[PDB]
């Protein structure tokens, strides 16, 4: 299975990962494949943040899914 | 009435390429006629063809899309428009209708060879039409299969601009290619009067009085965008009146009114009729509201000089010569004229900052800064502070009627600090998300182990401010609780929000630096009910806001928009915003957008964290109590991931004392009083220790030690200073502590033997005697002072008080009688 | 197993009386016709012509003789075993009819005696002093027979007596009485006193017991000294030789130190037998360390001072010599009243010997729970209105029926009653009208209920003054047995049914009745009251028994001392109680108990030591009931000293006299729990402090910072147009200040800012420099922030923490700094 | 009927009465006999006093009884 993850900047990420891969997983992979590290990782999917530690089977998040990965940082 | 999709002659492509096309190919080309074929100069720039060139067809243009609009509001605000023969009115122009009309009305004018008026007006059409059918084929490609949808539209048009039998009210396309070219002529009158009430005559029926003055309104405001001069307006003007159909003239009033042409000369002691009279007639007036009005020439602000200087400026020949120019004027110009009238309906506000503190807020902030330093107050019910029990509608109570920002701006530093020991009070205090899937998640442990990062106060500031964006457990529960829509919402859930948001406020308002932006974008996942409800409201705003010319229709403008308010669906809480549209349309997929305008800066939005590329460039808005998000336009955006429909309603912020909102003081003033009210314990000590029963038992023990002694004692005055010093003291002494007399009390003290005289005897029951007079000696003295000194001047103390006495009161304690 | 007597005494009988007056007008009184000491002798002027053997020796034999009989009734009731005559009788069984033909007899013992003389002669002086009776009951026969003496058998029977014949001094009671009560006479004038005193103590043991007869030679010596005779000590260590009285011999001592026995038996020896070298009489205090006599003698190691207590050689001598001698030995009526009064002291000493002394006789001072009551009584009399028919309410307390039945029996009520005042007798009257209807029951079941307060309004009272008051009261308590038989009955706690107003009434009026008395009696104390009861027979039966066991353990003593079982017998059988705790009605007129009332029960009351302090009654006229009452004091006790039985009343049942001794000490104070009184009374008095509680209700009061808030705002758009010459830089730069500081000051709490934004404030001239009408009213309403802020910097200032020095000054003990507290205030 | 009351001072007066007579008509005859004013006179039969208005064969006082008379004063 393979889903893709765009970001704002208009790059669209994709990763073939299986349902049992956690959001921490995914995030990691999101990571290697791109940089990004978990702590800015913001994924949302259907409008609904994804917490870590529940993986993709507990959220619906199935064939071809389109995730969106936007940066999220503390300020200063 | 249907929902607009947000087609604008500002932004489609398909209409701006066509003007291109005729200025590329016409419009910027010189005259190969006579007439006025000499060029003129503006600041340097040739503008060949000045009045009717490219100005002059992007304002007909603008002109079909401001009286769409009006008409469409007319209909909204239930006004009969003129019919055409298939029952349609000009409301129901549809968009792609409105594209093909402007796209005609590009090329309506391309087929002039010179400004010759009369002779050769068919040729010209002609022309025209010939030019229009060009620019079709040669982009026949892009656009029959898109905007025309057969080469019989495209003859449908092309005959509308070749005017074949003065046809000019056949269809939409006829009323707007033609009134709206007839609507430029506002310019080179003879005199304004005649000619603006003529013009109004012939657009009048189609969309109404109110839309007429409307269009002539905004296009004066288009004449100053395009640097085009703009003439006065004298309904006491006394040149003559000019009848506009057949350049004629009326004769005192004679009728049969009995047109006259201008070469018939007559009698003696008849004229021709003035402007003012046909201003003046009942006829006239049922039509046209310019009697007794007045509008001046110009701008405002600029003396004939400064104005003359404009005129001639670079900017009308980049008006004349770049689309993208004129354009942008126009554009502005629309968009100004959908905010005067809101402005003008309101009362006008000098100060764009929050207003100072009132009474309650400075209390609730007091009682905020005493809960966060003594969080132990926290029971799961209530709060309990110096002796006063809050409970969830205190809360409540000041989440809907203090302005939560100024609350904040009335903590400080000390306060964020004690953030984190309230979190560590509220350790394991489970907060529920409004996604009642998702699981609880403990409120201060997550501070702790995930969101609290260390630092000094900023980085707590920083800190909360990366709670409330990042954790929708958190965020959810505190928003919802902020706009009164939360349910089954625990009471510590309410406190930590009624906390929070005060503290965040300060937070972002301490950290942001940033300079406000002017639109930000706020997404919603509305219910199709409630959104069909904001839609409703919005388009009766936006049908009564509309400009004016003679007849200024605030009063209604004031009265819809106070009815169909919903900016509190953005007060109460810091309410999340973007300057990215594509945050809340593309990342969340909300169905409903706010295009939030603050080009007065009223909304004071904070940054929320980064806005490093790929951010969510998030800022914040507590909305505040004298500003409204006032809607300008609601527009079709498509559909969501989910299916749902999407649309973008644009707010405008506008402050004004009208929008305050009116609320009875007093609801945190009163806790915060009762807390200041004293326990007063050394007094309830006083009070208790003057209850006190005496220790008549120790007395009696002491008459039975003096008895059993003095009855037996070989002593001469041990025995008679016993029996004549002691125990007489001790008999008086009970009696007095059994009756409570202070008289006898006082003077028994003197009635007591000295150390002396005790000490004259050195026997082991002596000394242990001595020591019980003494403490029974303390116990009548004690007793004596109270009720003979202390109470007394105590109650003199009172009383003096309950007089607002003072003074008195203090002598009442300083001046106490000796005994 | 022991009859009661019927108050047979020699002191009152009229035929032995009447026969000592014969024998002294016709023997003792006339001169000895002999030679042998027939010279009279004078004493303090009077003749007395026979005096070793005259009046005052035979009326002293006579007193012998009853005491000996009294003594041996309460030896056989103690169990002890008496010696028997001939007939099984023992000196117990002697009937008061027999002593007195047995006294009549003893009248004449000695009269037949010419002189002194002795041995020689001895049969004609008792023949003629059998002559000289003989001719008395012939002269008197008409009284004596047979009332006395029943037949002339009788009479010759004690004649024979007289006679002695053949000296059978122990055939009989009569004769033993006779001529023991002569021996008993014997003590004074036969040195050495050890050997005499021991050998009449074993001749007259046998017959009546050894405390019997301790209690005899001790109330001889009281005759004695009753008589103005000579009393001799006693020393067991005496070193002169002994005396064998019977044969008038010695015992002797031989060479080695062993007294001559017999084969043992002590070997007799006549005196003028002059015997062996180096063998010497046995001593008087070798006599009287012989086991045999120890067997049958308290005497040995004992001493006895002679002479009386108080009085030297001299005195005693000077005494010896006084008239009232020749007065004893020649005016019957006069020595019988010395040994009346003798008698009746011996049966006193031994009480007030078996108890703690008391010095004192008046009642004891007030004691805290007195005094408290006697304040709770005065607040229930001055306010009626606090009395309920369940229970009293006085002062937030309430006083149910125990309380006052507690005031009833752990109170003095007497004490309490000279505690109160005349203010609270006149309220008498007003407590009366509350009780109007209140119903007051006899305590004679068929009698019907009787309207207290009515009753008194109508029928008792008689107008006037306190002191009439005092005498309706009186009356009251004297006159209306509905109201005095149900009050008694409670106070004594013996009532049964009563109501709570009876003993509310009951607890108000023993007290209010005891002050009245006080007040109101003048009468000497009398020191013999009669106080009349009747008693089912089965209680007067069970206080017969009690008072013989308390006279049977009370003895006179020479040597051994019963006084624990005199203790003892008295703490188990005192009876006192039936004349305690209520204001007792008695008499001087006995036939006021017994006569008038036909009381089966008489108490002779005898207050010796003026103890009772008894109060008159009424009225004493001729045919008055002579009324006197008592509360008897709480450690004062009524003990017997005889029973008697006094014959039947007019419904035929016994009547019995109980002669009863008022004793006080301190044995008979009753334990009590302090504090039944005096808690309610403190509860009463624990002050209510009002002024403080609305003093901490206006320290507790709201500013109200909205008013100073608005009127910064009022100062704002006031200031935003200036009308007036420096009416607004004024409000700029004088009064928003001021505003700013106090709201901050008072929003805050600090006083400090309060005090000195008190100086902050204009004066009432700044403002005088404005007179416009927003200008008087702005002024009007600093005035009131000025107030606002006043209270606050003065009571959170100055006040509050001044009282909490002054609080801390006290539990501490140090008043002097509390008072500093108030004194020593700041300023701000 | 007559009746004897004995008084203290050894007096015994006689009285002809009936068993209904009150106790107050026989204090007026004891008044008229001897002199003795009847709110002075205190009357006891059998040990007990008799009470005003009740009568004589109340009290069962019949032929030849004897009842006793004290004087009976308020004090002052
Ligand atoms: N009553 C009307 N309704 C619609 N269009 C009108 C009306 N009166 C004038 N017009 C428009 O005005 C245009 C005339 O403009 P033009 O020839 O440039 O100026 P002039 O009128 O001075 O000759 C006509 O093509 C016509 O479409
Ligand atoms: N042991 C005794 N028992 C009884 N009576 C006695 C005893 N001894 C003496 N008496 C009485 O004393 C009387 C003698 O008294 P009196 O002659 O005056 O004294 P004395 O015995 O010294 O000669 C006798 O008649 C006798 O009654």
């Not at chain 1, 995030?27 to 913001?42: L, N, R, S, W, Y």
């Not at chain 2, 428009?81 to 090329?107: C, H, N, S, W, Y």
């Not at chain 2, 309904?235 to 009114?257: A, Q, T």
């Not at chain 2, 003290?749 to 403490?775: C, H, T, Y």
Request: hydrophobic share 35%.
């Amino acid at each position: 299975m393979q889903i893709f993850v765009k970001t704002l900047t208009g790059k669209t990420i994709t990763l073939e990962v299986e349902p049992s891969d956690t959001i921490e997983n995914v995030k990691a992979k999101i990571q290697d494949k791109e940089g990004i590290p978990p702590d800015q990782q913001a994924l949302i999917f259907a409008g609904k943040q994804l917490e870590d530690g529940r993986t993709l089977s507990d959220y619906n998040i199935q064939k071809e899914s389109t995730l969106h990965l936007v940066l999220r940082l503390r300020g200063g | 009435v249907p929902t607009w999709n947000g087609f604008s002659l500002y932004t489609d492509e398909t209409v701006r390429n066509a003007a291109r096309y005729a200025y590329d190919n016409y419009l910027g080309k010189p005259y190969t006629g006579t007439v006025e074929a000499t060029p003129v100069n503006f600041g340097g720039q040739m503008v060949y063809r000045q009045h009717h060139g490219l100005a002059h067809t992007l304002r007909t243009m603008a002109y079909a899309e401001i009286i769409v609009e009006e008409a469409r509001k007319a209909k909204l605000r239930g006004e009969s428009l003129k019919t055409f023969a298939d029952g349609r009115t000009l409301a129901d122009v549809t968009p792609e209708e409105l594209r093909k009309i402007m796209i005609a009305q590009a090329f309506f004018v391309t087929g002039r060879d010179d400004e010759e008026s009369s002779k050769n007006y068919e040729k010209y059409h002609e022309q025209s039409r010939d030019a229009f059918l060009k620019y079709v084929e040669e982009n026949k490609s892009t656009l029959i299969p898109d905007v025309f949808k057969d080469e019989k539209d495209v003859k449908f048009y092309a005959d509308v601009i070749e005017d074949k039998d003065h046809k000019w009210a056949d269809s939409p396309a006829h009323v707007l290619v033609n009134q709206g070219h007839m609507v430029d002529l506002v310019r080179v009158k003879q005199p304004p009067e005649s000619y603006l009430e003529y013009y109004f005559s012939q657009l009048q029926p189609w969309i109404g009085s109110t839309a007429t003055e409307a269009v002539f309104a905004t296009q004066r405001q288009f004449f100053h965008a395009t640097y085009e001069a703009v003439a006065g307006f004298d309904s006491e003007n006394k040149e003559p009146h000019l009848v506009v159909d057949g350049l004629g003239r009326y004769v005192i009033p004679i009728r049969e009114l009995k047109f006259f042409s201008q070469k018939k000369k007559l009698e003696e002691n008849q004229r021709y009729m003035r402007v003012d009279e046909y201003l003046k007639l009942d006829e006239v007036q049922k039509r046209f509201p310019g009697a007794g009005k007045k509008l001046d020439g110009g701008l405002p602000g600029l003396k004939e000089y400064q104005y003359l200087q404009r005129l001639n400026s670079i900017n009308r020949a980049r008006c004349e010569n770049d689309v993208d120019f004129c354009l942008g004027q126009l554009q502005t110009a629309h968009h100004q004229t959908k905010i005067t009238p809101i402005k003008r309906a309101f009362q006008s506000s000098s100060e764009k900052a929050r207003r100072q503190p009132n009474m309650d807020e400075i209390a609730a902030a007091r009682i905020v800064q005493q809960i966060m330093a003594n969080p132990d107050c926290i029971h799961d019910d209530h709060v309990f502070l110096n002796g006063q029990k809050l409970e969830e509608k205190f809360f409540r109570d000041l989440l809907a009627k203090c302005d939560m920002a100024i609350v904040g701006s009335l903590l400080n530093d000390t306060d964020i600090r004690n953030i984190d020991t309230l979190m560590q009070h509220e350790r394991n205090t489970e907060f529920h998300s409004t996604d009642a899937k998702a699981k609880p998640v403990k409120l201060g442990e997550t501070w702790e182990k995930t969101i609290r990062s260390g630092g000094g106060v900023t980085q707590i500031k920083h800190d909360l401010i990366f709670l409330m964006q990042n954790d929708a457990w958190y965020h959810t529960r505190v928003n919802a609780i902020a706009q009164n829509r939360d349910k089954d919402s625990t009471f510590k859930e309410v406190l930590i929000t009624a906390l929070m948001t005060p503290l965040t406020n300060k937070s972002l308002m301490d950290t942001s630096r940033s300079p406000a932006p002017k639109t930000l974008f706020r997404g919603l996942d509305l219910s199709e009910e409630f959104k069909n409800k904001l839609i409703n409201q919005a388009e009766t705003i936006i049908a009564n806001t509309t400009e004016h010319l003679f007849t200024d229709l605030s009063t209604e403008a004031f009265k819809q928009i106070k009815l169909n308010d919903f900016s509190q669906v953005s007060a109460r809480t810091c309410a999340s915003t973007s300057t990215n549209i594509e945050v809340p349309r593309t990342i969340f997929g909300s169905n409903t957008i706010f295009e939030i305008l603050d080009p007065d800066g009223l909304l004071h939005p904070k940054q929320v964290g980064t806005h490093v590329s790929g951010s969510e460039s998030e800022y914040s808005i507590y909305l505040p109590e004298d500003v409204a998000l006032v809607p300008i336009k609601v527009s079709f955006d498509g559909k969501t991931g989910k299916g749902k429909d999407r649309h973008i309603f644009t707010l405008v912020a506008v402050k004004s004392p009208d929008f305050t909102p009116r609320h009875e003081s007093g609801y945190a003033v009163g806790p915060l009083l009762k807390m200041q009210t004293p326990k007063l314990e050394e007094i309830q000590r006083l009070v208790e220790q003057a209850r006190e029963e005496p220790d008549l038992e120790r007395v009696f023990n002491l008459q039975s030690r003096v008895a059993r002694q003095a009855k037996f004692s070989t002593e001469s005055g041990y025995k008679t200073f016993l029996n004549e010093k002691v125990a007489p003291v001790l008999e008086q002494s009970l009696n007095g502590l059994l009756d409570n007399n202070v008289t006898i009390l006082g003077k028994v003290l003197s009635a007591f033997p000295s150390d002396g005289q005790w000490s004259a005897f050195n026997s082991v029951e002596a000394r242990q005697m001595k020591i019980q007079m003494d403490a029974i000696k303390q116990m009548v003295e004690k007793k004596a002072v109270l009720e003979g000194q202390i109470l007394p001047a105590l109650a003199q103390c009172q009383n003096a008080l309950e007089k607002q006495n003072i003074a008195g009161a203090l002598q009442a304690l300083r001046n106490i009688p000796s005994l």
